[PDB]
């Protein structure tokens with residue numbers, strides 16, 4: 001089994017740091033903000049061996065046809081914001097609508113991720129994030145790429161959401 005996972009969200013929220021924790025087991029400071037890359041990892045989740053193919057998105061805000069078709073191959077999406085950046089939380093709606101648009105579907109596996117939970121300078125309350133996730137009908141996972149809090153949980157929860165979708 002293989003799952004195509006895509007990590008989206010505003011610049012600086014920790015998409016690259018979360019991905020590199022999952023894949024390479026270390027915390028990277030100031031990874032080049034412009035680099036989009038992909039990684040594969042073999043995991044066991046609830047007894048099922050699978051390959052996670054993870055796209056760590058980056059780059060300019062552009063909407064080419066090639067970009068839509070490429071994003072459309074994603075089976076599940078992490079919607080990442082940082083808990084110290086209210087604008088990144090406000091931007092979650094945008095990324096969700098673009099995912100719906102390219103997938104031509106109201107039911108796309110997604111997980112809301114509030115990253116940088118190790119920082120004291122919080123501006124987005126856990127209750128606001130839980131309420132947003134409830135409104136979308138998706139899970140909310142608190143993470144820190146720095147301490148590895150919630151990292152496996154975020155990705156594995158997204159796989160569980162894909163499996164639920166495939167059962168419908």
Ligand SMILES: Oc1cc(-c2ncc3c(N4C[C@H]5CC[C@@H](C4)N5)nc(OC[C@]45CCCN4C[C@@H](F)C5)nc3c2F)c2ccccc2c1
Pocket residue numbers: 008009010011057058059060061062063064067068071091094095098099102
């Ligand atoms: O063809 C596509 C294209 C995208 C797509 N690709 C890149 C985006 C992009 N950048 C890339 C990364 C992340 C931030 C920065 C620029 N570096 N930024 C935004 O939005 C940014 C905000 C919020 C809205 C207005 N702008 C201005 C400010 F407010 C902030 N959206 C993007 C975006 F939708 C798709 C995304 C998901 C599903 C299918 C897609 C299909």
Ligand SMILES: Nc1nc2c(ncn2[C@@H]2O[C@H](COP(=O)(O)OP(=O)(O)O)[C@@H](O)[C@H]2O)c(=O)[nH]1
Pocket residue numbers: 009010011012013014015016017018028029030031032033115116117118119143144145146147
């Ligand atoms: N304290 C803390 N810093 C983080 C966390 N995740 C990312 N960072 C830092 O925030 C900055 C932006 O992270 P990055 O992974 O490049 O974000 P991206 O633009 O979403 O790929 C970098 O300096 C990271 O080291 C986190 O969970 N906690």
Ligand SMILES: [Mg+2]
Pocket residue numbers: 015016017031032033034035056057058
């Ligand atoms: Mg990055």
